[PDB]
One Martini backbone bead per residue (centre of mass of N, CA, C, O) as a GRO file, in nm:
protein
  426
    1UNK     BB    1  -1.912  -1.934   1.321
    2UNK     BB    2  -1.821  -2.139   1.028
    3UNK     BB    3  -1.545  -2.279   1.173
    4UNK     BB    4  -1.423  -2.536   1.401
    5UNK     BB    5  -1.171  -2.673   1.286
    6UNK     BB    6  -0.854  -2.761   1.051
    7UNK     BB    7  -0.770  -2.443   0.963
    8UNK     BB    8  -0.499  -2.461   1.138
    9UNK     BB    9  -0.404  -2.633   0.926
   10UNK     BB   10  -0.149  -2.755   0.730
   11UNK     BB   11  -0.270  -2.621   0.376
   12UNK     BB   12  -0.486  -2.460   0.465
   13UNK     BB   13  -0.756  -2.298   0.283
   14UNK     BB   14  -0.981  -2.023   0.425
   15UNK     BB   15  -1.300  -1.856   0.324
   16UNK     BB   16  -1.450  -1.539   0.446
   17UNK     BB   17  -1.754  -1.394   0.307
   18UNK     BB   18  -1.856  -1.199   0.505
   19UNK     BB   19  -2.072  -0.963   0.564
   20UNK     BB   20  -2.113  -0.653   0.659
   21UNK     BB   21  -2.207  -0.650   1.033
   22UNK     BB   22  -2.158  -0.965   1.106
   23UNK     BB   23  -1.895  -0.941   1.322
   24UNK     BB   24  -1.600  -0.979   1.247
   25UNK     BB   25  -1.395  -0.819   1.406
   26UNK     BB   26  -1.600  -0.853   1.701
   27UNK     BB   27  -1.613  -1.214   1.689
   28UNK     BB   28  -1.450  -1.349   1.492
   29UNK     BB   29  -1.129  -1.265   1.518
   30UNK     BB   30  -1.148  -1.332   1.859
   31UNK     BB   31  -1.188  -1.642   1.779
   32UNK     BB   32  -0.917  -1.717   1.640
   33UNK     BB   33  -0.710  -1.618   1.843
   34UNK     BB   34  -0.787  -1.772   2.055
   35UNK     BB   35  -0.709  -2.015   1.946
   36UNK     BB   36  -0.425  -1.997   1.873
   37UNK     BB   37  -0.375  -1.958   2.180
   38UNK     BB   38  -0.434  -2.220   2.283
   39UNK     BB   39  -0.264  -2.390   2.033
   40UNK     BB   40   0.030  -2.201   1.999
   41UNK     BB   41   0.009  -2.028   1.740
   42UNK     BB   42   0.193  -1.854   1.483
   43UNK     BB   43   0.057  -1.565   1.422
   44UNK     BB   44  -0.095  -1.372   1.139
   45UNK     BB   45  -0.224  -1.029   1.101
   46UNK     BB   46  -0.402  -0.855   0.793
   47UNK     BB   47  -0.410  -0.485   0.744
   48UNK     BB   48  -0.487  -0.268   0.508
   49UNK     BB   49  -0.540  -0.041   0.743
   50UNK     BB   50  -0.497   0.136   0.991
   51UNK     BB   51  -0.822   0.185   1.080
   52UNK     BB   52  -0.807  -0.138   1.115
   53UNK     BB   53  -0.580  -0.201   1.318
   54UNK     BB   54  -0.726  -0.018   1.551
   55UNK     BB   55  -0.979  -0.210   1.550
   56UNK     BB   56  -0.831  -0.459   1.618
   57UNK     BB   57  -0.691  -0.366   1.892
   58UNK     BB   58  -0.977  -0.329   2.041
   59UNK     BB   59  -1.100  -0.619   1.992
   60UNK     BB   60  -0.809  -0.774   2.097
   61UNK     BB   61  -0.848  -0.683   2.393
   62UNK     BB   62  -0.679  -0.910   2.645
   63UNK     BB   63  -0.457  -0.995   2.429
   64UNK     BB   64  -0.121  -1.128   2.302
   65UNK     BB   65  -0.090  -0.858   2.096
   66UNK     BB   66   0.107  -0.750   1.813
   67UNK     BB   67   0.181  -0.447   1.715
   68UNK     BB   68   0.253  -0.276   1.425
   69UNK     BB   69   0.250   0.057   1.316
   70UNK     BB   70   0.508  -1.199   2.487
   71UNK     BB   71   0.395  -1.281   2.197
   72UNK     BB   72   0.254  -1.479   1.922
   73UNK     BB   73   0.096  -1.261   1.799
   74UNK     BB   74   0.109  -1.039   1.443
   75UNK     BB   75  -0.024  -0.712   1.371
   76UNK     BB   76  -0.064  -0.607   1.035
   77UNK     BB   77   0.018  -0.453   0.735
   78UNK     BB   78   0.032  -0.557   0.401
   79UNK     BB   79   0.314  -0.355   0.370
   80UNK     BB   80   0.443  -0.459   0.627
   81UNK     BB   81   0.487  -0.768   0.547
   82UNK     BB   82   0.642  -0.688   0.237
   83UNK     BB   83   0.856  -0.477   0.334
   84UNK     BB   84   1.002  -0.656   0.536
   85UNK     BB   85   1.107  -0.894   0.324
   86UNK     BB   86   1.306  -0.695   0.145
   87UNK     BB   87   1.462  -0.830   0.378
   88UNK     BB   88   1.652  -1.119   0.422
   89UNK     BB   89   1.698  -1.039   0.734
   90UNK     BB   90   1.403  -1.103   0.796
   91UNK     BB   91   1.159  -1.340   0.783
   92UNK     BB   92   0.964  -1.445   0.930
   93UNK     BB   93   0.714  -1.710   1.102
   94UNK     BB   94   0.394  -1.875   1.054
   95UNK     BB   95   0.095  -2.083   1.058
   96UNK     BB   96  -0.092  -1.856   1.065
   97UNK     BB   97  -0.308  -1.696   0.828
   98UNK     BB   98  -0.477  -1.355   0.807
   99UNK     BB   99  -0.672  -1.189   0.597
  100UNK     BB  100  -0.791  -0.849   0.584
  101UNK     BB  101  -0.922  -0.775   0.282
  102UNK     BB  102  -0.826  -0.987   0.038
  103UNK     BB  103  -0.922  -0.808  -0.255
  104UNK     BB  104  -0.695  -0.622  -0.298
  105UNK     BB  105  -0.529  -0.461  -0.564
  106UNK     BB  106  -0.299  -0.386  -0.445
  107UNK     BB  107   0.051  -0.472  -0.474
  108UNK     BB  108   0.091  -0.591  -0.152
  109UNK     BB  109  -0.185  -0.765  -0.139
  110UNK     BB  110  -0.147  -0.937  -0.385
  111UNK     BB  111   0.154  -1.053  -0.275
  112UNK     BB  112   0.064  -1.146   0.032
  113UNK     BB  113  -0.138  -1.359  -0.124
  114UNK     BB  114   0.075  -1.504  -0.268
  115UNK     BB  115   0.245  -1.600  -0.041
  116UNK     BB  116   0.088  -1.743   0.112
  117UNK     BB  117  -0.067  -1.935  -0.069
  118UNK     BB  118   0.246  -2.088  -0.158
  119UNK     BB  119   0.283  -2.175   0.121
  120UNK     BB  120  -0.045  -2.299   0.125
  121UNK     BB  121   0.056  -2.522  -0.081
  122UNK     BB  122   0.357  -2.596   0.066
  123UNK     BB  123   0.239  -2.656   0.392
  124UNK     BB  124   0.359  -2.394   0.617
  125UNK     BB  125   0.036  -2.357   0.623
  126UNK     BB  126  -0.249  -2.141   0.714
  127UNK     BB  127  -0.559  -1.987   0.566
  128UNK     BB  128  -0.705  -1.659   0.570
  129UNK     BB  129  -0.976  -1.524   0.397
  130UNK     BB  130  -1.115  -1.253   0.439
  131UNK     BB  131  -1.394  -1.186   0.221
  132UNK     BB  132  -1.679  -1.077   0.004
  133UNK     BB  133  -1.465  -1.085  -0.277
  134UNK     BB  134  -1.333  -1.316  -0.372
  135UNK     BB  135  -1.143  -1.449  -0.586
  136UNK     BB  136  -1.273  -1.421  -0.858
  137UNK     BB  137  -1.635  -1.496  -0.887
  138UNK     BB  138  -1.820  -1.189  -0.915
  139UNK     BB  139  -2.105  -1.036  -0.754
  140UNK     BB  140  -2.312  -0.721  -0.740
  141UNK     BB  141  -2.523  -0.874  -0.555
  142UNK     BB  142  -2.485  -0.926  -0.276
  143UNK     BB  143  -2.568  -1.021   0.048
  144UNK     BB  144  -2.750  -0.894   0.330
  145UNK     BB  145  -2.816  -0.758   0.622
  146UNK     BB  146  -2.978  -0.592   0.457
  147UNK     BB  147  -3.154  -0.395   0.265
  148UNK     BB  148  -3.119  -0.338  -0.120
  149UNK     BB  149  -3.197  -0.054  -0.322
  150UNK     BB  150  -3.118  -0.116  -0.710
  151UNK     BB  151  -3.061   0.158  -0.916
  152UNK     BB  152  -3.042   0.274  -1.250
  153UNK     BB  153  -2.848   0.611  -1.316
  154UNK     BB  154  -2.777   0.863  -1.393
  155UNK     BB  155  -2.449   1.034  -1.343
  156UNK     BB  156  -2.251   1.279  -1.268
  157UNK     BB  157  -1.921   1.371  -1.430
  158UNK     BB  158  -1.965   1.647  -1.319
  159UNK     BB  159  -2.075   1.889  -1.310
  160UNK     BB  160  -2.353   2.073  -1.247
  161UNK     BB  161  -2.755   2.209  -1.223
  162UNK     BB  162  -2.961   2.014  -1.351
  163UNK     BB  163  -3.140   1.684  -1.362
  164UNK     BB  164  -3.081   1.575  -1.032
  165UNK     BB  165  -3.254   1.609  -0.750
  166UNK     BB  166  -3.235   1.338  -0.622
  167UNK     BB  167  -2.955   1.385  -0.479
  168UNK     BB  168  -3.064   1.659  -0.295
  169UNK     BB  169  -3.367   1.556  -0.184
  170UNK     BB  170  -3.193   1.356   0.016
  171UNK     BB  171  -3.219   1.268   0.371
  172UNK     BB  172  -2.979   1.154   0.395
  173UNK     BB  173  -2.671   0.988   0.370
  174UNK     BB  174  -2.370   0.977   0.143
  175UNK     BB  175  -2.208   0.794  -0.108
  176UNK     BB  176  -1.974   0.892  -0.366
  177UNK     BB  177  -1.793   0.733  -0.595
  178UNK     BB  178  -1.461   0.793  -0.760
  179UNK     BB  179  -1.213   0.776  -0.968
  180UNK     BB  180  -1.074   1.008  -0.840
  181UNK     BB  181  -0.968   1.307  -0.720
  182UNK     BB  182  -1.055   1.531  -0.925
  183UNK     BB  183  -1.369   1.430  -0.957
  184UNK     BB  184  -1.434   1.469  -0.652
  185UNK     BB  185  -1.381   1.788  -0.671
  186UNK     BB  186  -1.590   1.847  -0.811
  187UNK     BB  187  -1.841   1.690  -0.697
  188UNK     BB  188  -1.813   1.859  -0.423
  189UNK     BB  189  -1.853   2.176  -0.510
  190UNK     BB  190  -2.113   2.153  -0.617
  191UNK     BB  191  -2.247   2.058  -0.361
  192UNK     BB  192  -2.174   2.321  -0.207
  193UNK     BB  193  -2.334   2.501  -0.423
  194UNK     BB  194  -2.594   2.291  -0.300
  195UNK     BB  195  -2.541   2.291   0.061
  196UNK     BB  196  -2.350   2.073   0.110
  197UNK     BB  197  -2.183   1.844   0.307
  198UNK     BB  198  -1.822   1.761   0.276
  199UNK     BB  199  -1.596   1.467   0.213
  200UNK     BB  200  -1.296   1.372   0.139
  201UNK     BB  201  -1.172   1.038   0.034
  202UNK     BB  202  -0.838   0.892  -0.006
  203UNK     BB  203  -0.517   0.787  -0.024
  204UNK     BB  204  -0.427   1.066   0.123
  205UNK     BB  205  -0.693   1.092   0.387
  206UNK     BB  206  -0.804   0.805   0.491
  207UNK     BB  207  -0.611   0.822   0.752
  208UNK     BB  208  -0.691   1.087   0.888
  209UNK     BB  209  -1.027   1.141   0.745
  210UNK     BB  210  -1.241   0.908   0.874
  211UNK     BB  211  -1.332   1.039   1.125
  212UNK     BB  212  -1.491   1.291   1.006
  213UNK     BB  213  -1.751   1.126   0.962
  214UNK     BB  214  -1.864   1.046   1.236
  215UNK     BB  215  -1.810   1.362   1.363
  216UNK     BB  216  -1.982   1.542   1.099
  217UNK     BB  217  -2.165   1.443   0.948
  218UNK     BB  218  -2.209   1.451   0.645
  219UNK     BB  219  -2.397   1.421   0.351
  220UNK     BB  220  -2.122   1.356   0.213
  221UNK     BB  221  -1.914   1.113   0.067
  222UNK     BB  222  -1.602   1.172  -0.148
  223UNK     BB  223  -1.478   0.866  -0.300
  224UNK     BB  224  -1.267   0.662  -0.334
  225UNK     BB  225  -1.189   0.322  -0.314
  226UNK     BB  226  -1.071   0.322  -0.031
  227UNK     BB  227  -1.358   0.242   0.087
  228UNK     BB  228  -1.303  -0.076  -0.045
  229UNK     BB  229  -1.152  -0.181   0.310
  230UNK     BB  230  -1.393  -0.140   0.573
  231UNK     BB  231  -1.540   0.126   0.577
  232UNK     BB  232  -1.753   0.322   0.757
  233UNK     BB  233  -2.006   0.553   0.642
  234UNK     BB  234  -2.245   0.593   0.788
  235UNK     BB  235  -2.520   0.539   0.538
  236UNK     BB  236  -2.815   0.530   0.299
  237UNK     BB  237  -2.630   0.617   0.033
  238UNK     BB  238  -2.519   0.468  -0.286
  239UNK     BB  239  -2.301   0.631  -0.520
  240UNK     BB  240  -2.222   0.462  -0.878
  241UNK     BB  241  -2.048   0.504  -1.184
  242UNK     BB  242  -1.824   0.235  -1.242
  243UNK     BB  243  -1.559   0.352  -1.185
  244UNK     BB  244  -1.204   0.408  -1.282
  245UNK     BB  245  -0.889   0.442  -1.262
  246UNK     BB  246  -0.607   0.346  -1.531
  247UNK     BB  247  -0.263   0.236  -1.438
  248UNK     BB  248  -0.048   0.231  -1.738
  249UNK     BB  249   0.171   0.070  -1.934
  250UNK     BB  250   0.279   0.281  -2.172
  251UNK     BB  251   0.563   0.308  -2.354
  252UNK     BB  252   0.750   0.286  -2.103
  253UNK     BB  253   0.482   0.409  -1.923
  254UNK     BB  254   0.286   0.587  -1.660
  255UNK     BB  255  -0.046   0.601  -1.724
  256UNK     BB  256  -0.330   0.844  -1.638
  257UNK     BB  257  -0.596   0.767  -1.817
  258UNK     BB  258  -0.875   0.754  -1.785
  259UNK     BB  259  -1.131   0.465  -1.761
  260UNK     BB  260  -1.276   0.220  -1.611
  261UNK     BB  261  -1.451  -0.070  -1.530
  262UNK     BB  262  -1.543  -0.215  -1.268
  263UNK     BB  263  -1.522  -0.489  -1.080
  264UNK     BB  264  -1.768  -0.650  -0.968
  265UNK     BB  265  -1.576  -0.649  -0.668
  266UNK     BB  266  -1.621  -0.305  -0.663
  267UNK     BB  267  -1.929  -0.272  -0.666
  268UNK     BB  268  -2.001  -0.489  -0.422
  269UNK     BB  269  -1.807  -0.269  -0.221
  270UNK     BB  270  -1.946  -0.006  -0.285
  271UNK     BB  271  -2.255  -0.117  -0.187
  272UNK     BB  272  -2.099  -0.256   0.115
  273UNK     BB  273  -2.157   0.018   0.279
  274UNK     BB  274  -2.430  -0.127   0.266
  275UNK     BB  275  -2.621  -0.291   0.424
  276UNK     BB  276  -2.562  -0.317   0.769
  277UNK     BB  277  -2.871  -0.323   0.876
  278UNK     BB  278  -3.159  -0.482   1.042
  279UNK     BB  279  -3.459  -0.289   0.948
  280UNK     BB  280  -3.316  -0.151   0.688
  281UNK     BB  281  -3.337   0.043   0.374
  282UNK     BB  282  -3.114   0.071   0.144
  283UNK     BB  283  -2.911   0.278  -0.136
  284UNK     BB  284  -2.810   0.173  -0.484
  285UNK     BB  285  -2.675   0.384  -0.697
  286UNK     BB  286  -2.509   0.340  -1.051
  287UNK     BB  287  -2.409   0.296  -1.358
  288UNK     BB  288  -2.367   0.033  -1.565
  289UNK     BB  289  -2.099  -0.195  -1.585
  290UNK     BB  290  -1.871  -0.423  -1.551
  291UNK     BB  291  -1.514  -0.519  -1.523
  292UNK     BB  292  -1.284  -0.777  -1.497
  293UNK     BB  293  -1.082  -0.708  -1.703
  294UNK     BB  294  -0.749  -0.575  -1.551
  295UNK     BB  295  -0.472  -0.716  -1.643
  296UNK     BB  296  -0.354  -0.419  -1.761
  297UNK     BB  297  -0.278  -0.344  -1.513
  298UNK     BB  298   0.000  -0.245  -1.308
  299UNK     BB  299  -0.042  -0.396  -1.061
  300UNK     BB  300   0.071  -0.668  -1.167
  301UNK     BB  301   0.378  -0.604  -1.203
  302UNK     BB  302   0.402  -0.496  -0.921
  303UNK     BB  303   0.324  -0.777  -0.760
  304UNK     BB  304   0.565  -0.903  -0.905
  305UNK     BB  305   0.806  -0.726  -0.798
  306UNK     BB  306   0.752  -0.808  -0.492
  307UNK     BB  307   0.729  -1.118  -0.492
  308UNK     BB  308   1.009  -1.170  -0.620
  309UNK     BB  309   1.142  -0.987  -0.355
  310UNK     BB  310   0.979  -1.200  -0.104
  311UNK     BB  311   1.141  -1.504  -0.258
  312UNK     BB  312   0.753  -2.119  -0.691
  313UNK     BB  313   0.571  -1.825  -0.693
  314UNK     BB  314   0.236  -1.740  -0.669
  315UNK     BB  315  -0.057  -1.622  -0.692
  316UNK     BB  316  -0.381  -1.620  -0.606
  317UNK     BB  317  -0.488  -1.879  -0.808
  318UNK     BB  318  -0.682  -1.686  -1.017
  319UNK     BB  319  -0.434  -1.461  -1.064
  320UNK     BB  320  -0.236  -1.577  -1.198
  321UNK     BB  321  -0.324  -1.489  -1.508
  322UNK     BB  322  -0.166  -1.232  -1.450
  323UNK     BB  323   0.105  -1.274  -1.442
  324UNK     BB  324   0.310  -1.124  -1.692
  325UNK     BB  325   0.552  -1.298  -1.576
  326UNK     BB  326   0.806  -1.489  -1.485
  327UNK     BB  327   0.889  -1.606  -1.226
  328UNK     BB  328   1.130  -1.362  -1.102
  329UNK     BB  329   1.194  -1.171  -1.336
  330UNK     BB  330   1.218  -0.930  -1.083
  331UNK     BB  331   1.447  -1.013  -0.960
  332UNK     BB  332   1.710  -0.885  -0.693
  333UNK     BB  333   1.985  -0.810  -0.583
  334UNK     BB  334   2.051  -0.750  -0.281
  335UNK     BB  335   2.163  -0.424  -0.327
  336UNK     BB  336   1.908  -0.384  -0.525
  337UNK     BB  337   1.678  -0.428  -0.300
  338UNK     BB  338   1.777  -0.221  -0.081
  339UNK     BB  339   1.710   0.041  -0.305
  340UNK     BB  340   1.413  -0.019  -0.359
  341UNK     BB  341   1.290   0.016  -0.050
  342UNK     BB  342   1.405   0.319   0.001
  343UNK     BB  343   1.183   0.390  -0.213
  344UNK     BB  344   0.976   0.330  -0.119
  345UNK     BB  345   1.000   0.386   0.215
  346UNK     BB  346   1.152   0.680   0.180
  347UNK     BB  347   1.021   0.808  -0.131
  348UNK     BB  348   0.742   0.724  -0.245
  349UNK     BB  349   0.742   0.479  -0.432
  350UNK     BB  350   0.655   0.325  -0.684
  351UNK     BB  351   0.712  -0.010  -0.761
  352UNK     BB  352   0.795   0.046  -1.073
  353UNK     BB  353   0.987   0.281  -1.012
  354UNK     BB  354   1.194   0.158  -0.837
  355UNK     BB  355   1.268  -0.086  -0.999
  356UNK     BB  356   1.415   0.065  -1.199
  357UNK     BB  357   1.592   0.227  -1.089
  358UNK     BB  358   1.777  -0.022  -0.939
  359UNK     BB  359   1.834  -0.198  -1.147
  360UNK     BB  360   1.989   0.063  -1.347
  361UNK     BB  361   2.125   0.212  -1.126
  362UNK     BB  362   2.406   0.263  -0.991
  363UNK     BB  363   2.371   0.461  -0.756
  364UNK     BB  364   2.211   0.576  -0.477
  365UNK     BB  365   2.298   0.921  -0.549
  366UNK     BB  366   2.176   0.933  -0.796
  367UNK     BB  367   1.981   1.207  -1.038
  368UNK     BB  368   2.010   1.223  -1.341
  369UNK     BB  369   1.762   1.030  -1.426
  370UNK     BB  370   1.583   1.351  -1.382
  371UNK     BB  371   1.711   1.474  -1.669
  372UNK     BB  372   1.809   1.241  -1.900
  373UNK     BB  373   1.568   1.180  -2.041
  374UNK     BB  374   1.352   1.233  -2.253
  375UNK     BB  375   1.154   1.492  -2.365
  376UNK     BB  376   0.865   1.372  -2.339
  377UNK     BB  377   0.929   1.345  -1.988
  378UNK     BB  378   0.862   1.601  -1.927
  379UNK     BB  379   0.770   1.814  -1.649
  380UNK     BB  380   0.458   1.961  -1.559
  381UNK     BB  381   0.257   2.197  -1.494
  382UNK     BB  382  -0.080   2.331  -1.518
  383UNK     BB  383   0.022   2.609  -1.660
  384UNK     BB  384   0.279   2.456  -1.857
  385UNK     BB  385   0.556   2.467  -1.709
  386UNK     BB  386   0.849   2.350  -1.655
  387UNK     BB  387   1.015   2.176  -1.450
  388UNK     BB  388   1.254   2.324  -1.210
  389UNK     BB  389   1.607   2.290  -1.058
  390UNK     BB  390   1.831   2.235  -0.827
  391UNK     BB  391   2.134   2.127  -0.788
  392UNK     BB  392   2.399   2.141  -0.541
  393UNK     BB  393   2.573   2.278  -0.823
  394UNK     BB  394   2.364   2.521  -0.928
  395UNK     BB  395   2.209   2.328  -1.168
  396UNK     BB  396   1.971   2.371  -1.376
  397UNK     BB  397   1.691   2.128  -1.401
  398UNK     BB  398   1.477   1.943  -1.596
  399UNK     BB  399   1.186   1.729  -1.512
  400UNK     BB  400   1.327   1.409  -1.698
  401UNK     BB  401   1.259   1.124  -1.654
  402UNK     BB  402   1.363   0.802  -1.771
  403UNK     BB  403   1.116   0.716  -1.550
  404UNK     BB  404   0.752   0.751  -1.623
  405UNK     BB  405   0.530   0.827  -1.367
  406UNK     BB  406   0.255   0.960  -1.282
  407UNK     BB  407   0.161   0.922  -0.994
  408UNK     BB  408   0.430   1.109  -0.903
  409UNK     BB  409   0.231   1.391  -0.995
  410UNK     BB  410  -0.072   1.277  -0.890
  411UNK     BB  411  -0.295   1.143  -0.710
  412UNK     BB  412  -0.161   1.254  -0.381
  413UNK     BB  413   0.083   1.341  -0.515
  414UNK     BB  414   0.376   1.612  -0.529
  415UNK     BB  415   0.606   1.724  -0.672
  416UNK     BB  416   0.776   1.841  -0.443
  417UNK     BB  417   0.865   1.584  -0.364
  418UNK     BB  418   1.032   1.453  -0.602
  419UNK     BB  419   1.238   1.735  -0.598
  420UNK     BB  420   1.337   1.656  -0.309
  421UNK     BB  421   1.506   1.451  -0.451
  422UNK     BB  422   1.633   1.496  -0.735
  423UNK     BB  423   1.817   1.763  -0.552
  424UNK     BB  424   1.935   1.584  -0.301
  425UNK     BB  425   1.742   1.609  -0.021
  426UNK     BB  426   1.644   1.281  -0.069
   0.00000   0.00000   0.00000
């Protein structure tokens, strides 16, 4: 344990920065809840992912905790907390809030910590943030439970043949972080034609396929940033090119082109996959430097869209500089918020797309915005022909949305699901 009491006093903000593998989920979290239950405080616990929520349920074995897909402790995902507050008829209160993996730059995660920070600064709760890389200044090589030898090497950015023998001559298991699902597939194919087993983890596969890692012990896990929020990959080496995809609003559209250097918090979390056990020395092989200035990413606008609709609120204080507009800018009328919530939760829309649709379109039944956009917004398959579909009246449409978000058409979303919506089947 790190803190005694007073941590549950209204207006207290506590940051627990504990290294991975020193018993946070199964030692520290269960002691914090014991205290809450003993003091009879309505406690909220936020997990980043279903994988971590399930792990919390095992560690909180034998307490009155309510887990969400007569107890005073509720456990749910970051995203569940925020999505619930999008119904103004929703909005239960807790006096203590514990947020696990509180560094995540997912918009729901940013909005949750901002909302809870706002409440605690007004003395409506206590807030614990559990993360090795708290928002604010980060170190790329923070302390670990066991040794990590970190070395800079050139890392392949796609398929290779010769010149990188150190990758495949290695005897232990490796996690290789990649900036995108597409780049992952290239790396995965090359490793497999060099005789290695590979599992790919990303936004799309993580919830389902995390368990194959433990079960199948592949030579390589080729992973996106999805493994930076509590994933135990049980590897002895990380390979980290220190890049990520850069979703950005450019000329009124969300683009996904090229990469950014990771933030130092990301680099530390990637490295943080190893060094979990004392008595053994692991390896972190990386290429190049970090860039902490991610203020350009659309995630901050999306965090504001959510925060303005679950609520003067601020982001979690160091992050407030990254709020792109005046607080409240994106607030919707109750009726439009209901549309917004449906698009997020039932149609798998990004916050950016769901906001533009709900703010602007007349009725929840209109689909004409999906074909009435400017010509340059038309959506192509990888084969080069523009996507077409039929409206219920048999009219042939070209997919050409008024608001274009590249994330709807690749990187773990399929054109086919968006066409289900556009054709009025969803």
